[PDB]
From a paper:
[name] recognizes specific epigenetic modifications on DNA strands and histone H3 tails through its SET- and RING-associated (SRA) domain and tandem Tudor domain (TTD)–plant homeodomain ([name]), respectively. Furthermore, the E3 ubiquitin ligase activity of [name] plays an essential role in [name] recruitment to DNA methylation sites, and is enhanced by association with hemi-methylated DNA and H3K9me319,20. In this report, we identify dual mono-ubiquitylation of [name] (PAF15Ub2) as a molecular mark coupling [name] recruitment with DNA replication. [name] in a complex with PCNA also undergoes [name]-mediated dual mono-ubiquitylation, which is essential for [name] recruitment, and subsequent maintenance of DNA methylation.
The [name] finger of [name] (hPHD) has been shown to bind to N-terminal 1ARTK4 residues of histone H313,14. Given that the N-terminal portion of [name] shares significant homology with the N-terminal tail of histone H3, we reasoned that hPHD likely to bind the N-terminal portion of [name]. Isothermal titration calorimetry (ITC) demonstrated that hPHD bound to human PAF152-11 with Kd = 2.2 ± 0.3 μM. This value is comparable to that for the N-terminal histone H3 peptide (Kd = 1.5 ± 0.1 μM). In order to determine the binding mode of hPHD to [name], the crystal structure of hPHD bound to hPAF152-11 was determined at 1.7 Å resolution. The structure showed that the hPAF152-11 peptide bound to the acidic surface of hPHD, with the 2VRTK5 sequence of hPAF152-11 being recognized in a manner similar to that of the 1ARTK4 of histone H3. The N-terminus of hPAF152-11 formed a hydrogen bond with hPHD-E355, and hPAF152-11-V2 was surrounded by the hydrophobic residues V352, P353, and W358 of the hPHD. hPAF152-11-R3 and -K5 formed an electrostatic interaction with hPHD-D334 and -D337 and a hydrogen bond with hPHD-C316, respectively. The importance of the above interactions in the complex formation was further validated by mutation analysis. ITC data demonstrated that hPHD-D334A/D337A failed to bind to WT hPAF152-11 while the WT hPHD was unable to bind to hPAF152-11-R3A or -T4D. Highlighting the importance of the hPHD recognition of hPAF15, in vitro ubiquitylation assays revealed that [name] D334A/D337A and [name] R3A or T4D mutations significantly decreased the ubiquitylation of hPAF15, as well as the [name] H741A mutation that disrupted E3 activity.
Residue numbers in the entry:
A (entry chain A): 299 to 364
B (entry chain B): 1 to 6
Write the structure that this text describes.
């Protein structure tokens, strides 16, 4: 083999390594921002504070990297 | 920004 050792690519499992790094959820992939440093994914609405839309800038850095 | 959908 799987791409992710932690969930073994099971779409019915939550996974904070290959899905939302905060909640593990796979839903709303168009709202999961990819960090341009660590490449973890983050639901805009799991961030604290939450972002109300997908940012327009080219790059974005998660709370663990900025 | 890149999203998981990309
Ligand atoms: Zn995984
Ligand atoms: Zn989330
Ligand atoms: Zn990051
Ligand atoms: Zn982390």
């Amino acid at each position: 083999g799987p791409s992710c050792k932690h969930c073994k690519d099971d779409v019915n499992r939550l996974c904070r390594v290959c899905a939302c790094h905060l909640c593990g959820g796979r839903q709303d992939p168009d709202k999961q921002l990819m960090c341009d440093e660590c490449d973890m994914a983050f639901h805009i609405y799991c961030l604290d504070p939450p972002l109300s839309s997908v940012p327009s800038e080219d790059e974005w850095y998660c709370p663990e990297c900025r | 920004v890149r999203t998981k959908a990309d």
